[PDB]
Amino acid sequence: AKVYFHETFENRDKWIDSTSSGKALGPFKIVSGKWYGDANNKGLQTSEDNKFYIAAAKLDEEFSNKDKNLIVQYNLKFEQGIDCGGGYIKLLPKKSIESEEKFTPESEYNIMFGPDVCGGSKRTHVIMNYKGKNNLIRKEIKCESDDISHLYTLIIRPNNTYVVKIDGVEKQEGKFDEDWDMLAPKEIDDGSGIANPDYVYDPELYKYDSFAYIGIDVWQVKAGTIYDDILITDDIEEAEKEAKVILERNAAEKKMRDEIKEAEN
Ligand SMILES: [Ca+2]
């Protein structure tokens, strides 16, 4: 069992803010949160409204998912009552950027995954790099938009198939087939899955020769989004063992949140 990355955010020593994006950035903070299931646990929070948040970290080791499972599993919370804001992550190959601080919204990524909320639109992104900066998308499931943590899980299997789960419950599965349309570079994934259908099937869409970095690059209107925990592994049993710990801690979190609301406004 090979764990390629497990960030619990005791600190963000590994994560480097971008110097290359040209955008107005805000600072991340390591915080407990307004409600939590473990008083010694902490998370990565966006601290300032109407700013971008752009940083990247190196994985524990460079790897390829050829002929292997890949599990991307992370716990994300919109504690602020989100009106418009991203909450997703990106995985990047070694050649995308010379070092962490070169990461920008335009850098080449292998995979973009996670929730994204704005103006009524609420989607879980699953974007797969196809060729160059062209990506594939399909019609996407809703994401959660309340104020407690939710575990997002993406499983990529080497028969070119995938599974999407929220809080340990399957919400979508399939093969990377003509359900998916091709997105042009820089074009928005609006969640409908409707773009350019004119591209040849790749039986190796699932596979990337290099995973080396992970990056966060989100716009925030109301800031306060918390990235609690990030796991990258090739081992389904290890992913399930860590999910159990996190889901039990999210249950205690929710009970603290319900007890606070029951006493307040
Ligand atoms: Ca944590």
Residue numbers in the entry: 14 to 206, 289 to 360
Source paper text:
Similar to its ER membrane homologue calnexin (CNX) ectodomain, CRT is composed of a globular domain, into which a flexible arm-like P (proline-rich) domain is inserted. The globular domain is made up of seven concave and six convex β-sheets forming a legume lectin fold. We have investigated the CRTs of two distinct parasites, Trypanosoma cruzi (TcCRT) and Entamoeba histolytica (EhCRT), for which a pathogenic role has been proposed.
E. histolytica is the causative agent of amoebiasis, a disease mainly characterized by dysentery that leads to about 100 000 deaths per year. During this process, EhCRT is exported from the ER to the phagolysosomal cupule, where it favours the phagocytosis process in a way similar to that described for human CRT on the surface of macrophages during the clearance of apoptotic cells. A similar EhCRT construct was then produced and beautiful crystals were obtained. The X-ray structures of the corresponding TcCRT and EhCRT constructs were solved using molecular replacement and refined to 2.45 and 2.15 Å resolution, respectively. The first evidence is now provided of a complex conformational transition with the junction reoriented towards P-domain closure. Very intriguingly, a very reproducible electron density was observed within the GBS in the first EhCRT crystal form that was not related to the crystallization medium.
